[PDB]
Amino acid sequence: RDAAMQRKLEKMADQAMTQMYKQARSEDKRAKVTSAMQTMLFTMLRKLD
């Protein structure tokens, strides 16, 4: 009982760890592309004459 209650828990804990890790990575890439897009627009606008 009290071992089947535990050894099945580290699996779900580990996969939750991995999930929120990749979610944080994707969220950071989101900010990266936001910055890149905005700076591209502001650099291309300066040529407008």
Partner 1 sequence: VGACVLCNSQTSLRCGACIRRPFLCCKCCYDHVISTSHKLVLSVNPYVCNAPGCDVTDVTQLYLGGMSYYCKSHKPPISFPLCANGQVFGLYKNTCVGSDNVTDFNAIATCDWTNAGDYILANTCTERLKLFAAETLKATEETFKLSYGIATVREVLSDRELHLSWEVGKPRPPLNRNYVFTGYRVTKNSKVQIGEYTFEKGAVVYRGTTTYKLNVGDYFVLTSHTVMPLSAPTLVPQEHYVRITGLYPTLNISDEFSSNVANYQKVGMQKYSTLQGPPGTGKSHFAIGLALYYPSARIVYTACSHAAVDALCEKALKYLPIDKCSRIIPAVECFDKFKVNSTLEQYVFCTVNALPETTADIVVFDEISMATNYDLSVVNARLRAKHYVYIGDPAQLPAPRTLLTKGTLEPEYFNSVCRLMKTIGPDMFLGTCRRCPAEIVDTVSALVYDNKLKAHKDKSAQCFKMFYKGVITHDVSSAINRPQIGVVREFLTRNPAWRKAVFISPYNSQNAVASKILGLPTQTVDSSQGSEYDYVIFTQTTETAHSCNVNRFNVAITRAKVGILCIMSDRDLYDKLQFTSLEIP
Partner 2 sequence: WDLLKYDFTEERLKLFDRYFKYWDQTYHPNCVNCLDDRCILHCANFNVLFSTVFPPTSFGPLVRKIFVDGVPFVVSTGYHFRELGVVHNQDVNLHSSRLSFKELLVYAADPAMHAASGNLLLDKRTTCFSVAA
Cα end-to-end span (Å), the chain: 76
Nearer to partner 1, 6 or 43 (CB): 6
Q: Which two tokens stand for residue 40?
A: 């591209």
CA distances from 2 to 5, 8, 24 (A): 5, 11, 34
19 contributes a contact to partner 1 by CB under 8 A = yes
36 contributes a contact to partner 1 by CB under 8 A = no
Determine which residue in the list 3, 4, 12, 41 makes contact with partner 1, applying CB under 8 A: 12
Residue 8: DSSP 8-state: T
Interface contacts to partner 1, rule CB under 8 A: 8-9, 12-13, 16-17, 19-21, 23-24, 27-28
